[PDB]
Amino acid sequence: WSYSQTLSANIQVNALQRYQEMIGGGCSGAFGWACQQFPTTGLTPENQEEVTKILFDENIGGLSIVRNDIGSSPGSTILPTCPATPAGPFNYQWDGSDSCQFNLTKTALKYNPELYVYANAWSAPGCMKTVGTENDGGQICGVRGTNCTYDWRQAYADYLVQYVKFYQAEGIDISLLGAWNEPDFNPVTYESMESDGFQAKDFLEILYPTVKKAFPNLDVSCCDATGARQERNILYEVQQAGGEHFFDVATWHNYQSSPERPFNVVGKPNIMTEWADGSGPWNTTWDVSGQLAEGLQWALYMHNAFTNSDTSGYNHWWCAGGGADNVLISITGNSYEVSSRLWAFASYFRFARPGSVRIGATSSVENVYVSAYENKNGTVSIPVINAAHFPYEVTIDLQGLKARKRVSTFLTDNSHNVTLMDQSELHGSVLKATVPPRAVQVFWLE
Amino acid sequence: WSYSQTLSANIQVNALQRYQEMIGGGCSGAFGWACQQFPTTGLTPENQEEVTKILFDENIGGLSIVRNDIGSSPGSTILPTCPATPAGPFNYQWDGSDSCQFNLTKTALKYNPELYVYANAWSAPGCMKTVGTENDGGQICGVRGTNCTYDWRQAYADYLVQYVKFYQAEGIDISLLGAWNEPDFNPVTYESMESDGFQAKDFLEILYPTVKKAFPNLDVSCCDATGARQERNILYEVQQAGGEHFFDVATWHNYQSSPERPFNVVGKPNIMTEWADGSGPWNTTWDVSGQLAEGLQWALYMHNAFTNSDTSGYNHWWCAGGGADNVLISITGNSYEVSSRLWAFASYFRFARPGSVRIGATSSVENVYVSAYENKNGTVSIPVINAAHFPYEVTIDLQGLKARKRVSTFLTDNSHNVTLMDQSELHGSVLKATVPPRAVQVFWLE
Ligand SMILES: *[C@@H]1O[C@H](CO)[C@@H](O[C@@H]2O[C@H](CO)[C@@H](O[C@@H]3O[C@H](CO[C@H]4O[C@H](CO[C@H]5O[C@H](CO)[C@@H](O)[C@H](O)[C@@H]5O[C@H]5O[C@H](CO)[C@@H](O)[C@H](O)[C@@H]5O)[C@@H](O)[C@H](O[C@H]5O[C@H](CO)[C@@H](O)[C@H](O)[C@@H]5O[C@H]5O[C@H](CO)[C@@H](O)[C@H](O)[C@@H]5O)[C@@H]4O)[C@@H](O)[C@H](O[C@H]4O[C@H](CO)[C@@H](O)[C@H](O)[C@@H]4O[C@H]4O[C@H](CO)[C@@H](O)[C@H](O)[C@@H]4O[C@H]4O[C@H](CO)[C@@H](O)[C@H](O)[C@@H]4O)[C@@H]3O)[C@H](O)[C@H]2NC(C)=O)[C@H](O)[C@H]1NC(C)=O
Ligand SMILES: *[C@@H]1O[C@H](CO)[C@@H](O[C@@H]2O[C@H](CO)[C@@H](O[C@@H]3O[C@H](CO[C@H]4O[C@H](CO[C@H]5O[C@H](CO)[C@@H](O)[C@H](O)[C@@H]5O[C@H]5O[C@H](CO)[C@@H](O)[C@H](O)[C@@H]5O)[C@@H](O)[C@H](O[C@H]5O[C@H](CO)[C@@H](O)[C@H](O)[C@@H]5O)[C@@H]4O)[C@@H](O)[C@H](O[C@H]4O[C@H](CO)[C@@H](O)[C@H](O)[C@@H]4O[C@H]4O[C@H](CO)[C@@H](O)[C@H](O)[C@@H]4O)[C@@H]3O)[C@H](O)[C@H]2NC(C)=O)[C@H](O)[C@H]1NC(C)=O
Ligand SMILES: *[C@@H]1O[C@H](CO)[C@@H](O[C@@H]2O[C@H](CO)[C@@H](O[C@@H]3O[C@H](CO[C@H]4O[C@H](CO)[C@@H](O)[C@H](O[C@H]5O[C@H](CO)[C@@H](O)[C@H](O)[C@@H]5O)[C@@H]4O)[C@@H](O)[C@H](O[C@H]4O[C@H](CO)[C@@H](O)[C@H](O)[C@@H]4O)[C@@H]3O)[C@H](O)[C@H]2NC(C)=O)[C@H](O)[C@H]1NC(C)=O
Ligand SMILES: *[C@@H]1O[C@H](CO)[C@@H](O[C@@H]2O[C@H](CO)[C@@H](O[C@@H]3O[C@H](CO[C@H]4O[C@H](CO)[C@@H](O)[C@H](O)[C@@H]4O)[C@@H](O)[C@H](O[C@H]4O[C@H](CO)[C@@H](O)[C@H](O)[C@@H]4O)[C@@H]3O)[C@H](O)[C@H]2NC(C)=O)[C@H](O)[C@H]1NC(C)=O
Ligand SMILES: *[C@@H]1O[C@H](CO)[C@@H](O[C@@H]2O[C@H](CO)[C@@H](O)[C@H](O)[C@H]2NC(C)=O)[C@H](O)[C@H]1NC(C)=O
Ligand SMILES: *[C@@H]1O[C@H](CO)[C@@H](O[C@@H]2O[C@H](CO)[C@@H](O)[C@H](O)[C@H]2NC(C)=O)[C@H](O)[C@H]1NC(C)=O
Ligand SMILES: *[C@@H]1O[C@H](CO)[C@@H](O)[C@H](O)[C@H]1NC(C)=O
Ligand SMILES: *[C@@H]1O[C@H](CO)[C@@H](O)[C@H](O)[C@H]1NC(C)=O
Ligand SMILES: *[C@@H]1O[C@H](CO)[C@@H](O)[C@H](O)[C@H]1NC(C)=O
Ligand SMILES: *[C@@H]1O[C@H](CO)[C@@H](O)[C@H](O)[C@H]1NC(C)=O
Numbered sequence A, B: 001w002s003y004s005q006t007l008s009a010n011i012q013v014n015a016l017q018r019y020q021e022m023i024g025g026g027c028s029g030a031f032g033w034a035c036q037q038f039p040t041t042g043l044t045p046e047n048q049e050e051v052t053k054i055l056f057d058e059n060i061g062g063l064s065i066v067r068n069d070i071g072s073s074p075g076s077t078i079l080p081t082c083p084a085t086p087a088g089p090f091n092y093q094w095d096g097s098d099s100c101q102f103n104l105t106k107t108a109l110k111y112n113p114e115l116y117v118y119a120n121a122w123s124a125p126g127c128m129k130t131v132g133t134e135n136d137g138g139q140i141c142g143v144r145g146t147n148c149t150y151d152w153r154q155a156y157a158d159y160l161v162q163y164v165k166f167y168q169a170e171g172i173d174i175s176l177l178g179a180w181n182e183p184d185f186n187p188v189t190y191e192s193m194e195s196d197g198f199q200a201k202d203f204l205e206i207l208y209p210t211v212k213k214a215f216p217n218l219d220v221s222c223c224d225a226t227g228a229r230q231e232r233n234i235l236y237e238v239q240q241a242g243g244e245h246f247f248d249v250a251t252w253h254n255y256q257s258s259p260e261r262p263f264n265v266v267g268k269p270n271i272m273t274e275w276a277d278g279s280g281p282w283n284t285t286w287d288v289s290g291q292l293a294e295g296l297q298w299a300l301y302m303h304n305a306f307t308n309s310d311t312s313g314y315n316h317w318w319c320a321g322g323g324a325d326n327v328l329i330s331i332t333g334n335s336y337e338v339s340s341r342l343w344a345f346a347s348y349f350r351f352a353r354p355g356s357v358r359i360g361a362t363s364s365v366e367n368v369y370v371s372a373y374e375n376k377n378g379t380v381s382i383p384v385i386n387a388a389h390f391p392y393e394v395t396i397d398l399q400g401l402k403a404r405k406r407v408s409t410f411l412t413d414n415s416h417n418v419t420l421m422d423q424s425e426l427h428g429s430v431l432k433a434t435v436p437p438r439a440v441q442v443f444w445l446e
């Protein structure tokens, strides 16, 4: 809702002030959701392509991250049968599908050659765990606080590297490798595995050098905690255990704690690798209810992560399929719907591409939010969020950008999906525009 | 889960460092939940008393806040029929029950004489709103951005004070008065009412003097937003509209944004007035899953609010009854179960009574959390949270508390509910103790 009133906001953008390098937005097709996106029956191949294009085409959804589950369940793991001991031998199996995640990754790469693939195990194979199953939490055998018949850490590290080798042999490079999902949480009934930071360091000290031997440019994550606080605690313990240099990227989910402060790690980026409305009905609205599932709320949640916790990337939970509101695109039979959450993602990531660097951006109005990003090639994106219920006349002063010639204005609100509104020549270093209520307006500088 | 290893933590508590004055913990019986706590069949009267005692007895749950809905629905409002205009006559009706909230409040007061009653409207009566109904959001007629046939602001302010008058005539002091619930959110199907901060100020400028003339000691809240960020935006706009001194307390919910920083008000306390696990099954565990419903997680959530947003109070959604995990005490027929979330509440509020002041407390270990509270009468509570998965040997150095002579230690974990562990004399200003894993240990100094 909105009403008639106008106020003004002053914004300063400064390319000389430089923060995190951005990675992108994304989503997962784990647990067979990739197969719902690529079912053959129901959704036609043309429509399967179109849904994947909508997500990963730079000009539409703008996403770049595909998060795949390194599966540990029957039919989803590269190690369906374990050897008796870590001495092996190991019989690795690849079916060319990977629960359709290979289809998702290959197709997304077709639409985005800069795809950033995150391969993330939810659990070690059961034989490698204290509980002897991939379900019900438990620990990698061999970390402190365990007493298995053998130490399985090297074997688990080798198994993760073998998963990466399967994708590499198909011509797909993995960018990030993770060994746990939500180690602070035991959901009991599906792939899970628990850890504190001392135990995680006991594994990372074997995983990290094992990975760099095979793939010197493959980054290692820690540790996909359910919330930012839980992630900070694991990071603290990893560093206290001596493992500061046994991971490269801090990963965390937004379910069980949200930050307003950076993470307790020096020289490492962080990615919010999973969040969704896990309980509500499927929802597409931008700003009708004000509920957390809506597109405008997701634009604001991202602004918070990128400006207050220096976050470099952001993932929805699932990409597309069923699961009510856990997807960005709902699929039913041969039909689909796009949530306007995707236009919140695109408002950032259609314009701030991989390798962009967040730069200084301030606003004189508390709920007229701004951030700004400078691509490797010098183009600059300034997503402004007018979270107020009436228009703001913004004045944007540009510093360090005298080389820019043109400005394009894009608008997302209840009647616009990243719509091009205006294109003009820059004839100084000041931009003036009226941003409608409850909207994201992106100023694209070239 | 836990394992065998012991590390040490150094804690410094300084009474010369002072922060917020505490109000307490609490819950609501709104929307008929008070009638589930005091039903006409099922739970016996003796068990109704016992449930309420478990919540509001200082020695058990330790709660002090009862949050009541000033109802606007048929059967639940003091204005069942509206006049055609704001001139009235207003035929108010008081039924002595208030959807059993009178019974809840009266009984809670019997167990806690310092009860802090928060009377909170979810909506104005529909006749005073743009939408003509108490449901479906909409605005108070007369604030900016409305075009109703009449300006109903004074009428709504008089209605709210009349509700207070009915309680005060029955011998119950109301401590806080609120005129919106979640004005950033339209749930459509139940009592609701929308506002930004400019519109809110347009009403508060009427409500506030009306309130203080009738009840000089009655505080006014703003504005029970669904989250901290939404609350900060409304507070910004109220202040921008000139209304900094037309409200006394900042109220907010933890559903749609959680803080790690203070609120944008000077000289006003804040209360987290509503949160719960809104979607999960009934849950009582302390630390089994690591899911946000568990008692340990609530201890940590409260530690965050009290130490990082200087929060003075904290409310569960409902007190007792049905509604799965939305209550602190689940009632089924003539039976009831207590969630260990209540022992997270008690660990703070059994010992930090109303009027206590949070004081300096630091920890040398990131996930050994500490806060500290000094009661008006000089006693001091130090709730320590060992969020690690193994025991910590803590050394607590006390500054500014030479007059303390005795220390009692209380423990909450998977097998203790605020259990008294030890009582010793205080010699020197140094306490030493081992805090078990995944536990809240309270040091009570007298
Ligand atoms: C400051 O401040 C602070 C805070 O506030 C304080 O403190 C506090 O105080 C308060 C007041 O006093 C209190 O309260 C009270 O209480 C009472 C009771 O008591 C009892 O109980 C308790 C508890 O118990 C429990 O717990 C424990 C621990 O753990 C244990 O051990 C036990 O066993 C139990 O347990 C159980 O339960 C639980 C829960 O609770 C659980 O958990 C478990 O498991 C189990 O089950 C206790 O504590 C006590 O004891 C104590 O004390 C005694 C004396 O008495 C002694 O002898 C002992 O020894 C002890 O002490 C020791 O210990 C402790 C701990 O325990 C420590 O702390 C110390 O220090 C020492 O060391 C007992 O046993 C009650 O009763 C009360 O009530 C009342 O009041 C109210 C209000 O307030 C009301 O409402 C009610 O109703 C009543 O009223 C009445 O009374 C009054 C007076 O009293 C009046 O006013 C009125 O009017 C009425 O009157 C009527 O009635 C009467 C009778 O009663 C008659 O007489 C007449 O005539 C008429 O008729 C109250 O509530 C609390 O407690 C406290 N806290 C603490 C923590 O401590 C302080 O003090 C201050 N200080 C200054 C200096 O100021
Ligand atoms: C610095 O970095 C910047 C960031 O990367 C970079 O800007 C971006 O560059 C890339 C790469 O060049 C651009 O992506 C290409 O886009 C081509 C299609 O472009 C046409 O469509 C665009 C989108 O059009 C929609 O949106 C417009 C804006 O709202 C509307 O006006 C349109 O009507 C249309 O709207 C419809 O769709 C919307 C969703 O998209 C929807 O909301 C809306 O409602 C409606 O449904 C237009 O922007 C573009 O128009 C501009 O350019 C034309 C000139 O072509 C002008 O005439 C226009 O006036 C306007 O200025 C076009 O109309 C793709 O074809 C192209 O695909 C190829 O590349 C990808 C990989 O990048 C491959 O996967 C793909 O297969 C293609 O590969 C083929 O070609 C390549 C070589 O091109 C070759 O190597 C390969 O082998 C193969 O043969 C690509 O995706 C991107 O658009 C730019 N973004 C922005 C914001 O500008 C910038 O240039 C860099 N600067 C410098 C100096 O280096
Ligand atoms: C400290 O504080 C804690 C927290 O308040 C106290 O611990 C809690 O106590 C309550 C009782 O006051 C417990 O609830 C009861 O739990 C028992 C045990 O249930 C378990 O074991 C059963 C036997 O093996 C098993 O049947 C149960 O499984 C069924 O139920 C679960 C849960 O509903 C369900 O998921 C399953 O599918 C099964 O259907 C379960 O594994 C239980 O027997 C009790 O049920 C009786 O009462 C209820 C009404 O309350 C009624 O519905 C039943 O029909 C039956 O009549 C009841 O649920 C609770 O589990 C405890 N929680 C924790 C974390 O321990 C503790 O007591 C306090 N300490 C002290 C000293 O007071
Ligand atoms: C910008 O981006 C937004 C968000 O992606 C787009 O808006 C969404 O578009 C989808 C698809 O068109 C909408 O979904 C469809 O909504 C129709 C309207 O439903 C309402 O109204 C009818 C009566 O008019 C009621 O019966 C109904 O209950 C709703 O209240 C539905 O009729 C559609 O249902 C059909 O398809 C589904 C499968 O998806 C079947 O299950 C049904 O049986 C039926 O055949 C469908 O649900 C969605 O509502 C839009 N959301 C919003 C917020 O607008 C914009 O279109 C896009 N802009 C542009 C220009 O492309
Ligand atoms: C999420 O978005 C959906 C649309 O995808 C909203 O759906 C409306 O739901 C109500 C009842 O809940 C229906 O009366 C409307 O017809 C629906 N609209 C459409 C366009 O389908 C839903 O309200 C949104 N939920 C939230 C919490 O914002
Ligand atoms: C919340 O607490 C309840 C106990 O009140 C837990 O209940 C267990 O549920 C499983 C099935 O989900 C049963 O097999 C167990 O027997 C139950 N335990 C008890 C003691 O009843 C529930 O698991 C907890 N949920 C979370 C998320 O922690
Ligand atoms: C998935 O990919 C494989 C190989 O790329 C292909 O053989 C198979 O048909 C694909 N499945 C679907 C549903 O597209
Ligand atoms: C570990 O398990 C083995 C096999 O049961 C047992 O013999 C050994 O004592 C255990 N170690 C410890 C330290 O308990
Ligand atoms: C509410 O309180 C009154 C007395 O104040 C009592 O008579 C009535 O029975 C109570 N109602 C319930 C449901 O307990
Ligand atoms: C207010 O609404 C009425 C119709 O209900 C309309 O006639 C009138 O012009 C409106 N007032 C203004 C100032 O627009």
Ligand SMILES: O[C@@H]1[C@@H](O)[C@H](O)OC[C@H]1O
Pocket (backbone or CB within 6 Å): A182, A185, A226, A255, A256, A278, B291, B292
């Ligand atoms: O679904 C889980 C949710 O219930 C919990 O709160 O956070 C982690 C999620 O995996």
Ligand SMILES: O[C@@H]1[C@@H](O)[C@H](O)OC[C@H]1O
Pocket (backbone or CB within 6 Å): A291, A292, B182, B185, B226, B255, B256, B278
């Ligand atoms: O139930 C509501 C929830 O859906 C929303 O997320 O936050 C406010 C709550 O009242």
Ligand SMILES: [Cl-]
Pocket (backbone or CB within 6 Å): A229, A257, B300, B301, B304
């Ligand atoms: Cl927290």
